[PDB]
Amino acid sequence: HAFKPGDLVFAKMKGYPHWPARIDDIADGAVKPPPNKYPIFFFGTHETAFLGPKDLFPYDKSKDKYGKPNKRKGFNEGLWEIQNNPHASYS
Numbered sequence: 025h026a027f028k029p030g031d032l033v034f035a036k037m038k039g040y041p042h043w044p045a046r047i048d049d050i051a052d053g054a055v056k057p058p059p060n061k062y063p064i065f066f067f068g069t070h071e072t073a074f075l076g077p078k079d080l081f082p083y084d085k086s087k088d089k090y091g092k093p094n095k096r097k098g099f100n101e102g103l104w105e106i107q108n109n110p111h112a113s114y115s
Contacts, residue, residue, distance in 0.1 A: 025082075027062055032083035032110050034090040035064045035075055041099065042081060042090040044106035048072060068102025070114045 027033075027047050035045035048063040050056055057063055057074040064075045081090065083106065091107075093100050105114070 027077065027080065030111065032106060033064070034081040034083065034086050035066065036079040036081070037073070037075075041094055041096060042086070043099070044068070044083075044091070044102040046106075046110060047080075065114070066098075066102065067105040067110070067114075068098035068100070 029047050029049040031047040033045050033047065034042040036042050044067040045064045046067070048065045050063055061074040061076050062080070063072055064080070065072050083091075091103060093103065105112070
């Protein structure tokens with residue numbers, strides 16, 4: 025399984041806990057990711073950033089480890105989104 029738009033993940037950024045997220049499509053006209061990176065939409069914060077596979081943990085495999093509440097802002101909101109409506113428009 026190569027990563028494709030719509031895949032659910034936990035995504036790791038420096039300074040944050042593994043974060044509920046999804047692989048997004050590239051909008052027409054938008055900036056494209058660097059070589060071998062993906063557009064990642066973060067649940068709860070609703071931000072997008074470019075990340076590579078080393079920082080992407082498939083949701084089903086990883087949810088037992090990473091899918092638990094914490095106090096960081098937006099996180100529990102993000103957990104609700106990935107669990108209840110992961111494919112919604114958050115625009």
